[PDB]
């Protein structure tokens, strides 16, 4: 991808595939609704 991908996974398989694929890079799952989105985003920007 060039633009950051938007996944459409009604079955929920793609999300767990992504978790598995980037698990070695310490991938974090969040949500827009969560109030924790701001600090998670900021930490991702600072430290990969």
């Amino acid at each position: 991808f060039n633009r950051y991908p938007l996944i459409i996974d009604p079955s929920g398989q793609a999300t767990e595939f992504i978790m598995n694929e980037y698990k070695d890079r310490k991938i974090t799952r969040t949500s827009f609704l969560d109030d924790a989105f701001r600090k998670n985003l900021e930490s991702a920007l600072r430290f990969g």
Binding site: K26, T28, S43, R46, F47
Partner: protein, 49 residues
């Protein structure tokens, strides 16, 4: 990077977290809170006074 600091009689208290190794480990990164900002503390750092 190794650092050497002279004139320690004018010691800056900002070094207190560094000297006390008040590091916080998260996501494989060792964050040190220098003043009000966080810095990934490289394991090769060393300071002499």
């Amino acid at each position: 990077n190794p650092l050497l600091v002279q004139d320690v009689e004018s010691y800056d208290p900002v070094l207190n977290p560094v000297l006390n190794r008040e590091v916080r480990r998260t996501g494989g990164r060792v964050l040190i809170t220098l003043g009000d900002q966080d810095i990934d503390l490289s394991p090769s750092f060393v300071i002499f006074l």
